[PDB]
Subunit: 391 residues, 5 copies
């Protein structure tokens, strides 16, 4: 005799005639109130300048045709109806690279005063400009805007639903333990117009995210200090031996191949030039000047075809030493000849020994200077890190 | 005269009016009982913190409108009808990264008392937090939650169908011989609420999986012990020869390039720091101190420009040896000069020989110390492995 | 006056009422006869344990509602109707990783006795367990099962259509000139049941495929024999020269980097351990012991700081040689001193020469032993290959 | 009593009969006016000769059946109706590689005079010919054409809507800070015909884009000048030492491996041959001739088995030096023999010294020539860069 | 009073009853005439034996139910109707790996005599057998076949539309400046039958394409001749120096790593063995025998522990030289002893000098032989290239 609640379900859907903007008067617009909450931040692609995010989105508006009195229908205040049977605004998002992949959820709440609500999850892979000038300590500011693609300001009006301060500070759900953590989501309403007599409404959410670089800092600092330490420990071997230049060029080749294979992996971009490359270039130049010093010292010490050092050089190298911290005539003729030969050989040996001593002293002094330079570089780096840590 | 069973098929579907929650009274909610069984575990992505699983899922609920007496229709108790002609709850899964790919199966059983059942396979690629602190011996605890996205607690209520102990211990179907094997699937019912006056029901299944690391253990241990053995066998060659430093730096370069090309392949993450990296750093430091010892020994042995060793040094190096386990005057003038030259050369040779002996003794002692250190490291590693094996 | 054949097309489709299992009596089940033929085998993924295949599939069953007399309708025995207007069983395939990509073909033959047939191509990417213990000479046994996901044994019954011996030996269409060639497709009917009072029917096809490894065999054998030959030819150079150890360590580094870059490319898995790795480890160990022999020989030959060899050593090294295949007193005082110095130098030279001869003899003997070992290894490898070739 | 605006919504859609080209007379064609605006330029693939772009596209035409008087319906001039209920032309784009991914936007404006408009975003990945002859300073000219695939010139006519000069200079929306920046979008109308009696209309937009190569220029110039500088600094070490050839071959191997790993990454194509490869080949040849010079100098200086240099050679090498910037008889018999031996040794030493001096002079001269050549190459390169900068 | 042309649009579509093969008599089949034109050739995958092509395809057939007199309907001869409202044959393509991605174009021309035409673009990624025996100069012959999947020969008959000679030579549209250029498209009609009493019609188009290898030829020839030239220039340095073997092994390692990293990139297959690998193996063997010659020459020249060369060897090495292009007794006793020591040293020096001269002569002769062999190889290669160029 008396059917179930469905007695009203057809009563609203008998002659609804969807596909038309539901208003009693066409002059007034329909107002849509939206709300977004972040759930997780998926990977960000610096090469393609595109990021992937996942949000829970909700909206509501007024139908003005789905109105009924609760008392007439068993106290019924709200119900759920399929979303394909009612008018739905076309609220899209700009700077999108694909339609995306998301479920349908073909249901919507409808209240007794015409208010209709829509809840949905949605994943966006979207293009924003990424700046990686300070690559490890990045703070990215990307934007996503909601707007009606075709309806103008006289048709659809965008409202923020919740208060902006509630939206800005909302960490109710967020997947931590990832590469990124968000700082805030700042909303802003704007009016967009390319030409005259045609304007639209947009709502832009600016997402601010910060990277945690501890893994990146370790992976970028450990090989560098490793090669610096091995260069320092390999500096202290005799220079006249021919293995010094081989050791230095082998270490330089190792640094070169490491730098090349890490040249584009970490700064995966085609525009930005982070300061990490500048520090790497500085380290490379330090290795180059160390190799040049080693080559010069090796060239200075070479026993064959030598000349006695010019007095002034020895006189100031001893000065900077204050701051480092019968027919018997043929018989005697032959003996005189062999003696003179031995004196010549001894003189060559003494000249070689003096040149070797000069090379040793110069090598020690230049090693001390290089150690001081490395100390200065390391202390100024840790000083800048402390300045970052304490603003 | 009398049609087939389809005489009831239209009788239930003549004026069903799908799209409305089927209840006689709107106050009571509709209860959905669900059940999941794992079938296989596909790949897990540590870089993206996402895994892929395949389950068989079933659910059932009560329609309260598809009711009939069996006796009236040729003893018919249950039938199958297309799933697009009846109301279906929107039971979704959170922490999902895509809609996924699964067939439709447009059929459902319906019993004579209104009970309706739904069976379906489904593959989920979903985001959970992976911890790889102990990378080879991982035990991952990931979660997947079933909930109604839009209907509240007053509309849909979630029930576990089978008993929790049956669900927890269920290995009826599972594809073994993979990288992972599951331990348990723990179910838990919860009530979810972000704001007030709006609450939902969720059912969370915690999947616990364990990795079998034998392949990983072999692939990570074989090159390490290979390079340790080759370092040990290359340690025992004469130090005064110049090939020792070249051999050591070549082996160090090999270890460096292997470590760099395996630096991110196995610990494919940007947060976690497994202890395998710590052991690799320890091995690298051991190689570095071995190279430093070789360089020091090479520097100590250098025949040119030497001085006699200070007595105390020789006196304690012989002490630690207890624990290692007429005008004929011009003629004689020339002969005296050449004799003195030969004495000078012999003295230099003797000094070089003494320094070489000192270097040999020190090299042998330091080799013994290094061998003892390697023995200690290897035995403590196998000891820790045994402690893991026997708790 | 008299329409075309379509006069019967509506006669069967006027009140068909699809979506219901077409039977006059609900007690008897509907029987579906299926048939599959392979067309080509696409790539197989050993890392993901998944393969891709392409088959032509056909099935037929009885409708019992699409029945007519041919004589009444211009001799018409069979026709074609859209597949969306008739009942279609939900015959799915387990161990599938995706819904796949295949066309629709919205047409089916229907005969005058109710028999209805369905033809379709379908590509499956499906998960099976791959064993690569003998990686080049693989014979893979994978399975694919057809079953009704939701209908039970009382509803749908599976039949093989053609005889099993015809299905097993069917090479009518197959794309050869690929990486794999199939041996047989063995069908087997089974009854599946997880719980009680609920059983289903499945038809499992076991596909057996064999790999042709000639390209793999060449690519795996050529570099190995290349490095063996270059090691053999580099073995025969003087040992006292310092380039021998450099040559050996360079070749060892080359083998190491080749093995590492081919460590996971060919055995692309995380479980299996093929014997090719065992042979590679054996070759590596052979190279290691060759390097150790070279280092020992180099250490044995070192002219500086030598002692005369102990008699017994020389006495058995000559034994194993049988099987390799006035004031004139100051003047004479100075002359005696210089003569004694020359005797000392000559004695050191003779000791060095004797030690060099000992090192040469030992190096030749160990080279012969190493060559014999390489010969033994190569002959036993070709012997095992012949045993494989002739069972 | 009086319904809403929907009173006209059915009035236009009661018997619209979509699917037919809406014209009162079939002889006249329907005219579609289109407009495109670039929004961003995504990645370009030089290997596949395909690019990805994102545009906002709009079009309008005349329906001639959706006509009404505003006064009759509450002043209503325009409305919005679903796009699936009206006739829509099939305006496609050639040289497309996929259907693409874009939303639907199922709404269109309709004016009271039958004018209907359609707005949509669309992303195209499309194939055009890329020329990279001057790879860093590229100016690409690609094309995209809009045409009706099936309707001929007698049915659909294409019009540009806005004036061509407005379309050509339109930077209202464009995502800068990318790899590319566009110069202009030139439109052109054309008539297309493959066979006779069948012609179509097309509208081709030529997009002109320019690359900003600063990152590419830095990444391509820094390693090159690095290796040039290290070659120059390693040139200045003594030639008789055996480490010079090792240093040169190590640097050549480094250049070779860098060139090979960058051989196809930057010029990612299979047709074009940019001039950067020509400059790299020139640098390689310079390194090769430097290595050949080093080998020749090393061969010239070799102390063992020497002959006195032919006079003419010394006489012109001193010429080019002007531009570089009793029974006592046995006793004396033995003394004469040993003296003659010492003279022979001294003569060999003097010959070796003279050859070493010759080698040193030649090495210095060739080093000066090589430095001059490097200076010439660097100055002509910077000169060509300046010519590019100032046309 | 009199409606538009749509007066006939319903007249054909009032009771069309699609889904049935439109014929007045079921005995005669329906004939479909097809035509294909290539537009561009996308990438070809040699690893997966699959290619991607893009064609414009058209077909037409006879409906026999869409017939009208033009005079009755305002001279109307042809119109356009949606393709979903009429019967469409299921003409598919075999050897396809996916459904593909193509637009719909829901429109078809219909003429007044029942002739209906369909135009569509379509991209196929399809599997054909690729032979790369002569990898740079490939001429691939792949096939694509059009057939009705389910309708037999008694239902659908395939016709070529245009004449075969017109189809074979058709370059009206084709995107040049790619990796491939097509030679011809040969059509062929065939009858296909697996079993008896069941036959179908197929139309196979054989596409013939040729590769342009200039980029491949340059990229494969430049490093090879580079390493040959550097080997030749490094051959000419003194053999007794220890850097020769290091240079040779370094160059061999460079060739090895280049060959390995290019081992599978260019011949990206698992079956074919191109002749380029044979030439690379020949070059490797040439480098190996050069290294063996260098090692033998180095072994022959070793000053320590030498014996005088056997006369015959010197006598034929001078022969092949024709074709290369009182108590004073103790005093004299000591002098005699030292003189004898000096004679012994001089004899050893002379023996070493003679052995060095022998080694130099042999090295020069073998260098000449190696140069002649390289000349022969290069000339026969350019000769074979000329034979290819002039058939
Ligand atoms: C781009 O190419 C088209 C095709 O030839 C040409 O008409 C047009 O002038 C070109 N534009 C520029 C800026 O070179
Ligand atoms: C291509 O292959 C088919 C199949 O055998 C053959 O009939 C045809 O002649 C071939 N075409 C050419 C140009 O070789
Ligand atoms: N199942 C989660 C329901 C839910 C609660 N709050 C929400 C906010 C937005 C949204 O899309 C969904 C929700
Ligand atoms: N064909 C397997 C039917 C089946 C048996 N038990 C199940 C449990 C869940 C499910 O989705 C399906 C099933
Ligand atoms: N066009 C191929 C028709 C055909 C013949 N035999 C078949 C077997 C199975 C199938 O799906 C299709 C077929
Ligand atoms: N929401 C942006 C609406 C808009 C303004 N101008 C446009 C031009 C083209 C287009 O597709 C869209 C638009
Ligand atoms: N817009 C191109 C129309 C066109 C002309 N000739 C064709 C041939 C085939 C085809 O699919 C299409 C066409």
């Amino acid at each position: 005799t008396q059917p179930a609640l469905l007695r009203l379900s057809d009563h609203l859907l008998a002659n609804y005639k969807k596909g038309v903007r539901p208003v009693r008067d066409w002059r007034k617009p329909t107002t849509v109130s939206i709300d977004v909450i972040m759930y997780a931040i998926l990977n960000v692609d610096e090469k393609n300048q595109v990021l992937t995010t996942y949000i829970w989105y909700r909206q509501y508006w007024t139908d003005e045709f789905l109105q009924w009195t609760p008392e007439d229908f068993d106290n019924v205040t709200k119900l759920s109806i399929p979303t394909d049977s009612i008018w739905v605004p076309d609220i899209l998002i700009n700077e999108f690279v694909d339609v995306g992949k998301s479920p349908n959820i073909p249901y919507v709440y409808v209240h007794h005063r015409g208010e209709v609500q829509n809840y949905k999850p949605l994943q966006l892979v979207t293009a924003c400009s990424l700046d990686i000038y300070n690559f490890p300590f990045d703070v990215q500011n990307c934007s996503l805007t909601f707007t009606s693609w075709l309806h103008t300001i006289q048709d659809i009006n965008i409202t923020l639903w919740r208060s902006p301060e509630e939206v800005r500070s909302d960490k109710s759900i967020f997947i931590n333990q990832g590469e990124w953590e968000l700082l805030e989501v700042f909303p802003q309403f704007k009016e967009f117009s390319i030409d005259i007599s045609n304007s639209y409404a947009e709502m832009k959410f600016y997402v601010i995210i910060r990277r945690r670089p501890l893994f990146y800092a370790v992976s970028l600092l450990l090989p560098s200090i490793f090669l610096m330490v091995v260069d320092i420990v390999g500096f202290c071997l005799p220079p006249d031996s021919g293995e010094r230049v081989s050791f230095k060029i082998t270490l330089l080749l190792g640094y070169s191949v490491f730098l090349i294979i890490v040249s584009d992996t970490l700064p995966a971009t085609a525009i930005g030039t982070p300061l990490i490359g500048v520090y790497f270039v500085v380290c490379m130049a330090l290795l180059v000047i160390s190799l040049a010093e080693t080559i010069f010292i090796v060239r200075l010490v070479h026993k064959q075809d030598l000349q006695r050092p010019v007095p002034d050089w020895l006189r100031h190298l001893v000065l900077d030493r204050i701051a480092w911290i019968l027919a018997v005539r043929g018989l005697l003729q032959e003996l005189s000849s062999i003696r003179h030969f031995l004196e010549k050989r001894d003189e060559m040996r003494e000249v070689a020994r003096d040149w070797l001593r000069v090379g040793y002293v110069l090598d020690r002094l230049l090693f001390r200077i290089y150690l001081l330079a490395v100390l200065a570089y390391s202390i100024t780096l840790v000083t800048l890190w402390s300045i970052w840590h304490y603003s």
